[PDB]
Amino acid sequence: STGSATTTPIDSLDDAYITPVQIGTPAQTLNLDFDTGSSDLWVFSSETTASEVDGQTIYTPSKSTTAKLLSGATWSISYGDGSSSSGDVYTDTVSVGGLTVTGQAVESAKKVSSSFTEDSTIDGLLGLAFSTLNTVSPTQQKTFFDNAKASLDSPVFTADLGYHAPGTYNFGFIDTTAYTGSITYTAVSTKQGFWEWTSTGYAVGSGTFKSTSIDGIADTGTTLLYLPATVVSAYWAQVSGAKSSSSVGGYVFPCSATLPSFTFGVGSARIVIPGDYIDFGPISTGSSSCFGGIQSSAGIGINIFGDVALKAAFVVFNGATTPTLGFASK
Numbered sequence: 026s027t028g029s030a031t032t033t034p035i036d037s038l039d040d041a042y043i044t045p046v047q048i049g050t051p052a053q054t055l056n057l058d059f060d061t062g063s064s065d066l067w068v069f070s071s072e073t074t075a076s077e078v079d080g081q082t083i084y085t086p087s088k089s090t091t092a093k094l095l096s097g098a099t100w101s102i103s104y105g106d107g108s109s110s111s112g113d114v115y116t117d118t119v120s121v122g123g124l125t126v127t128g129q130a131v132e133s134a135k136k137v138s139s140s141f142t143e144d145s146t147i148d149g150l151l152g153l154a155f156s157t158l159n160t161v162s163p164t165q166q167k168t169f170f171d172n173a174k175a176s177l178d179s180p181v182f183t184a185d186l187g188y189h190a191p192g193t194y195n196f197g198f199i200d201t202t203a204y205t206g207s208i209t210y211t212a213v214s215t216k217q218g219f220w221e222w223t224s225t226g227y228a229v230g231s232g233t234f235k236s237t238s239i240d241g242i243a244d245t246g247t248t249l250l251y252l253p254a255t256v257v258s259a260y261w262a263q264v265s266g267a268k269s270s271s272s273v274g275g276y277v278f279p280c281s282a283t284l285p286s287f288t289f290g291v292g293s294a295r296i297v298i299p300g301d302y303i304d305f306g307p308i309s310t311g312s313s314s315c316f317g318g319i320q321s322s323a324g325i326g327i328n329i330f331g332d333v334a335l336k337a338a339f340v341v342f343n344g345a346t347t348p349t350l351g352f353a354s355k
């Protein structure tokens with residue numbers, strides 16, 4: 026089997042991407058944030074505290090003839106950015122772009138943190154990291170991709186995120202028309218439960234390539250590109266007037282600047298992130314100070330190849346016996 030679904034930026038800055046998902050019988054379609062950096066499929070629901078729901082589409086398990094409460098099971102997650110959610114668990118039928126899993130764990134939110142309430146565009150998360158990170162207790166549950174994998178034509182999914190435009194998640198096949206040149210595959214460690222790999226280095230604009238190992242994660246659920254302070258300083262030094270602001274919480278730059286590109290290495294291959302991808306717009310409405318899309322990973326403890334990086338590539342999440350990641354230009 027295979028599946029294919031379009032993924033859409035939630036706003037004009039590509040702050041996150043949503044993908045429609047069918048849950049239950051009859052289908053209830055929710056727009057979920059496909060997150061290769063976490064491993065819970067959770068949704069806003071009929072059970073979510075009423076004051077914590079503000080425009081999201083909710084899953085109502087009582088209206089699904091295939092929903093079954095998973096006895097005694099609860100979940101609670103806290104993300105890298107400080108947001109959180111928790112609740113109980115059903116198993117139900119879940120489909121993505123024509124691909125169906127029966128008995129998928131659907132984690133129904135009883136509580137969500139304020140950032141989720143405040144964003145009406147995201148109805149929940151669909152985790153695509155390794156199932157070892159799933160938070161369901163006392164019996165850990167499998168991700169959508171883990172459940173689907175055996176049935177897929179090939180045990181893979183791909184992320185093709187758009188810059189200011191729709192993109193695609195495919196399951197079970199590689200669309201050879203969706204990228205240019207070849208796909209370069211690179212080793213993955215699953216020891217932290219992430220798609221963790223090692224970049225071979227970087228370049229800033231037309232500058233020469235610096236060969237240096239950067240360990241990090243391919244994370245569709247993180248918006249920005251988080252890299253070591255030395256690398257991030259080298260980037261922003263090329264932007265006149267750019268400064269790290271402790272009050273804002275990162276590098277900001279004059280909105281009138283034209284930003285240089287940033288290149289990262291995958292083996293001998295190179296993925297080029299155009300300068301415009303790094304512009305996250307005014308820090309507050311009407312400001313002429315803009316927020317940078319490349320930020321220091323210092324004190325978050327891990328480098329993160331988030332959407333800023335991934336949207337410059339066609340990305341293969343290869344779930345073979347020994348997982349690997351592939352990157353191509355596009």
Ligand SMILES: Nc1nc(CCc2ccccc2)cc(=O)[nH]1
Nearest residue numbers: 041060062104105106108246247
């Ligand atoms: N990998 C990853 N996932 C999340 C998911 C939660 C989320 C979703 C949209 C906006 C804000 C928070 C948060 C995070 O920091 N990293």
